[PDB]
């Protein structure tokens with residue numbers, strides 16, 4: 001009967017959907033750390049600087 | 059270690075008692091430093107509304123928060139300036155937590171935020 | 174500042190933080206809120222404990238001439254023979270906990286047992302600085318966060334003035 | 346909630362559940378219907394009793 005064949009494919013459908021879910025989570029986690037670090041590094045880059053007061057010679 | 063009532067210093071839990079040196083001991087006189095080595099990490103509880111976290115069964119539930127302490131001087135022999143650190147916290151079931159940071163160019167203060 | 178006669182050689186003994194909710198936010202229970210602070214190689218984690226009596230809680234919705242006068246406010250009784258509340262707010266606020274002082278409460282959602290922050294409400298968090306750090310000094314960096322159970326945290330970041338010239342100072 | 350004056354320190358005293366049939370379904374008698382609930386280590390089994398008078402209807 002059709003009942004047996006339906007159950008077999010059902011298991012396969014669940015496993016496939018889990019794979020595509022894993023890709024999206026892993027990619028978002030990788031891009032999270034890069035975007036956070038870039039923002040913090042740029043903030044330090046703009047604000048920091050050195051200034052010359054006076055120059056003397058002998 | 060349990061520290062849910064609040065603390066003035068987090069890094070003070072290193073002196074906290076975990077066990078007894080002898081059977082004649084009145085109080086827990088084995089410190090947390092002595093059991094934390096190069097292969098293991100320590101768990102410090104911050105919040106547990108469900109009371110699900112114990113030493114025998116450290117089960118993390120909804121609304122709970124923990125601190126993981128790593129003896130860096132034992133594992134790597136001290137982390138240095140301007141070095142990249144990458145890692146993961148892998149559970150048995152679920153998606154992992156991501157650790158990625160670069161250590162500051164110059165250590166100017168005692169306690170620093172990394173990530 | 175802890176010195177009134179000469180504030181120049183003084184240190185900070187009390188700190189007050191004004192906290193509100195964000196626009197279009199769900200209610201937040203302050204009992205599940207943890208406060209982090211970093212000062213001179215010391216990372217603190219402070220927590221409020223709800224109680225019916227002897228709780229670090231004060232109501233000041235009708236207005237006040239001094240905010241720092243709620244330290245003398247009664248929270249509990251010494252014994253059974255007390256006619257009025259004679260246990261002060263100073264005696265309960267220590268090095269592990271913070272106090273909650275209500276400024277605005279339109280819907281009456283804030284209690285000592287259940288401190289629930291709603292839309293339009295405002296609270297002041299008092300920290301005993303002389304207990305936690307032992308007094309904050311001149312030209313020092315303070316960094317911390319107010320972490321709820323659900324939601325986005327509030328950021329604390331300021332540097333203490335180079336010289337304390339007055340008794341009450343604005344930091345952030 | 347059971348407290349009107351201060352709902353913060355209150356608890357739920359009554360619960361209402363809206364129930365309909367599915368599309369293209371045969372009639373269901375509610376007298377033969379059993380309701381299960383699980384809360385804090387307590388498994389309940391509730392049942393309606395039909396009556397002419399003194400019935401919860």
Ligand SMILES: *[C@@H]1O[C@H](CO)[C@H](O)[C@H](O[C@@H]2O[C@H](CO)[C@@H](O[C@@H]3O[C@H](CS(=O)(=O)O)[C@H](O)[C@H](O[C@H]4O[C@H](CO[C@H]5O[C@H](CO)[C@@H](O)[C@H](O)[C@@H]5O)[C@@H](O)[C@H](O)[C@@H]4O)[C@H]3O[C@H]3O[C@H]([C@@H](O)CO)[C@H](O)[C@H](O)[C@H]3O)[C@H](O)[C@H]2O)[C@H]1O
Pocket residue numbers: 176177178179182
């Ligand atoms: C806030 O900030 C201020 C300013 O920065 C202070 O730091 C203050 O701390 C308090 O300081 C005072 C004064 O130092 C302390 O009170 C003192 O307690 C001592 C007890 S102890 O010895 O066990 O430590 C002494 O009893 C002090 O008395 C001393 O001073 C007397 C006066 O000395 C003056 O003499 C001549 C003028 O006549 C002058 O040339 C000098 O330069 C000097 O000023 C002296 O007779 C005693 O023999 C002894 O040495 C005591 O100070 C007392 O006097 C001061 C003030 O007059 C001094 O100018 C002040 O009123 C005090 O209230 C008073 O008790 C106190 O312990 C600290 O808390 C911060 O809170």
Ligand SMILES: *[C@@H]1O[C@H](CO)[C@H](O)[C@H](O[C@@H]2O[C@H](CO)[C@@H](O[C@@H]3O[C@H](CS(=O)(=O)O)[C@H](O)[C@H](O[C@H]4O[C@H](CO[C@H]5O[C@H](CO)[C@@H](O)[C@H](O)[C@@H]5O)[C@@H](O)[C@H](O)[C@@H]4O)[C@H]3O[C@H]3O[C@H]([C@@H](O)CO)[C@H](O)[C@H](O)[C@H]3O)[C@H](O)[C@H]2O)[C@H]1O
Pocket residue numbers: 348349350351354
């Ligand atoms: C819904 O939620 C709310 C809020 O969370 C409550 O929990 C409520 O439960 C009800 O609580 C009230 C108050 O606790 C209960 O009524 C009380 O019944 C008692 C009988 S018993 O002793 O056998 O248990 C007493 O008769 C209570 O009277 C007490 O309080 C009087 C006032 O105390 C105040 O005094 C000063 C101001 O003057 C202030 O500084 C204090 O902080 C304090 O508020 C006092 O004179 C009495 O000696 C006695 O100690 C009685 O409470 C009565 O008063 C309250 C309210 O004014 C207090 O602020 C209220 O109107 C009550 O209606 C009233 O009866 C009740 O049993 C609970 O059901 C939840 O339903």
Ligand SMILES: *[C@@H]1O[C@H](CO)[C@H](O)[C@H](O[C@@H]2O[C@H](CO)[C@@H](O[C@@H]3O[C@H](CS(=O)(=O)O)[C@H](O)[C@H](O[C@H]4O[C@H](CO)[C@@H](O)[C@H](O)[C@@H]4O)[C@H]3O[C@H]3O[C@H]([C@@H](O)CO)[C@H](O)[C@H](O)[C@H]3O)[C@H](O)[C@H]2O)[C@H]1O
Pocket residue numbers: 138139140162163164
């Ligand atoms: C410029 O920016 C950099 C980031 O791009 C970085 O922040 C620089 O700061 C420097 O950071 C490094 C850490 O990587 C540190 O240098 C190390 O210093 C200690 C000695 S200590 O006294 O400071 O504690 C360490 O022992 C290493 O010194 C060795 O090498 C030098 C030669 O350069 C020699 O004089 C010493 O005797 C000693 O042998 C040094 O680490 C470097 O060497 C290692 C290994 O070879 C060690 O075996 C690695 O190659 C590493 O990449 C090197 O950094 C300092 O704290 C700081 O200068 C910033 O200047």
Ligand SMILES: *[C@@H]1O[C@H](CO)[C@H](O)[C@H](O[C@@H]2O[C@H](CO)[C@@H](O[C@@H]3O[C@H](CS(=O)(=O)O)[C@H](O)[C@H](O[C@H]4O[C@H](CO)[C@@H](O)[C@H](O)[C@@H]4O)[C@H]3O[C@H]3O[C@H]([C@@H](O)CO)[C@H](O)[C@H](O)[C@H]3O)[C@H](O)[C@H]2O)[C@H]1O
Pocket residue numbers: 174175176177186187244245263340
């Ligand atoms: C941090 O540093 C501070 C340095 O600025 C300070 O040292 C803090 O400690 C606090 O010290 C003050 C005294 O300076 C104390 O405040 C007084 O407390 C009593 C409580 S009691 O049990 O001893 O009675 C009382 O609440 C006083 O208030 C009176 O005065 C006000 C205003 O005039 C009025 O509502 C009432 O009359 C009331 O009785 C309070 O003292 C204040 O008032 C005086 C004078 O006006 C009195 O004539 C001074 O102006 C003083 O500065 C005021 O504080 C605190 O108990 C203590 O915490 C430290 O934490």
Ligand SMILES: *[C@@H]1O[C@H](CO)[C@H](O)[C@H](O[C@@H]2O[C@H](CO)[C@@H](O[C@@H]3O[C@H](CS(=O)(=O)O)[C@H](O)[C@H](O[C@H]4O[C@H](CO)[C@@H](O)[C@H](O)[C@@H]4O)[C@H]3O[C@H]3O[C@H]([C@@H](O)CO)[C@H](O)[C@H](O)[C@H]3O)[C@H](O)[C@H]2O)[C@H]1O
Pocket residue numbers: 258259260261262264
């Ligand atoms: C937090 O900690 C605090 C210490 O850091 C403190 O303990 C706070 O509690 C407060 O304690 C004071 C006592 O120190 C209480 O005030 C007193 O109240 C009693 C009421 S009774 O029912 O117990 O009798 C009484 O009214 C006291 O008055 C005395 O003094 C006056 C004047 O000299 C006299 O007319 C009376 O007959 C009586 O003897 C009162 O204490 C005050 O007076 C003393 C001394 O002068 C006594 O010799 C102190 O100056 C004190 O500061 C005054 O308050 C408070 O009720 C309580 O809040 C705690 O919260």
Ligand SMILES: *[C@@H]1O[C@H](CO)[C@H](O)[C@H](O[C@@H]2O[C@H](CO)[C@@H](O[C@@H]3O[C@H](CS(=O)(=O)O)[C@H](O)[C@H](O[C@H]4O[C@H](CO)[C@@H](O)[C@H](O)[C@@H]4O)[C@H]3O[C@H]3O[C@H]([C@@H](O)CO)[C@H](O)[C@H](O)[C@H]3O)[C@H](O)[C@H]2O)[C@H]1O
Pocket residue numbers: 346347348349358359
């Ligand atoms: C679960 O928790 C609840 C907390 O919110 C609550 O405690 C529940 O208990 C219930 O308590 C309410 C009172 O708050 C009772 O309701 C009243 O019951 C009487 C029955 S009688 O036999 O005593 O007469 C009556 O039905 C009242 O209805 C009147 O008011 C409505 C609307 O104004 C109107 O149709 C009629 O005039 C009618 O007589 C009813 O009280 C309600 O109305 C009042 C006021 O408006 C009256 O002026 C309040 O608004 C109140 O909140 C209303 O409930 C229940 O008997 C009891 O189960 C607990 O189960």
Ligand SMILES: *[C@@H]1O[C@H](CO)[C@H](O)[C@H](O[C@@H]2O[C@H](CO)[C@@H](O[C@@H]3O[C@H](CS(=O)(=O)O)[C@H](O)[C@H](O[C@H]4O[C@H](CO)[C@@H](O)[C@H](O)[C@@H]4O)[C@H]3O)[C@H](O)[C@H]2O)[C@H]1O
Pocket residue numbers: 226227249250251252253254260
């Ligand atoms: C809030 O904080 C305050 C201050 O920190 C208290 O800790 C308070 O707890 C209360 O403490 C008092 C004192 O320890 C308790 O009162 C005792 O108990 C009885 C009353 S009852 O419990 O039986 O109803 C009595 O009043 C006792 O008094 C006796 O001792 C005194 C000596 O001080 C003496 O005068 C007499 O012999 C008298 O009989 C008292 O010890 C109270 O139960 C606590 O609630 C906290 O709520």
Ligand SMILES: *[C@@H]1O[C@H](CO)[C@H](O)[C@H](O[C@@H]2O[C@H](CO)[C@@H](O[C@@H]3O[C@H](CS(=O)(=O)O)[C@H](O)[C@H](O[C@H]4O[C@H](CO)[C@@H](O)[C@H](O)[C@@H]4O)[C@H]3O)[C@H](O)[C@H]2O)[C@H]1O
Pocket residue numbers: 263264265266267301303304
């Ligand atoms: C903020 O932080 C500071 C630290 O920087 C404090 O922790 C402060 O809390 C206060 O602590 C002091 C203790 O130092 C408390 O003062 C005590 O009050 C009791 C009253 S009761 O609690 O017993 O009811 C008492 O009056 C104490 O006095 C005793 O000790 C002195 C010695 O100093 C002695 O002379 C007396 O005879 C008596 O034995 C007193 O020390 C204060 O209540 C707290 O607010 C925090 O707010």
Ligand SMILES: *[C@@H]1O[C@H](CO)[C@H](O)[C@H](O)[C@H]1O
Pocket residue numbers: 235
């Ligand atoms: C503020 O005022 C109201 C009346 O408006 C009431 O008396 C409260 O007790 C007070 O806090």
Ligand SMILES: *[C@@H]1O[C@H](CO)[C@H](O)[C@H](O)[C@H]1O
Pocket residue numbers: 251252253254255
């Ligand atoms: C309560 O305590 C006070 C002192 O705080 C005093 O001994 C009273 O007699 C008691 O009732």
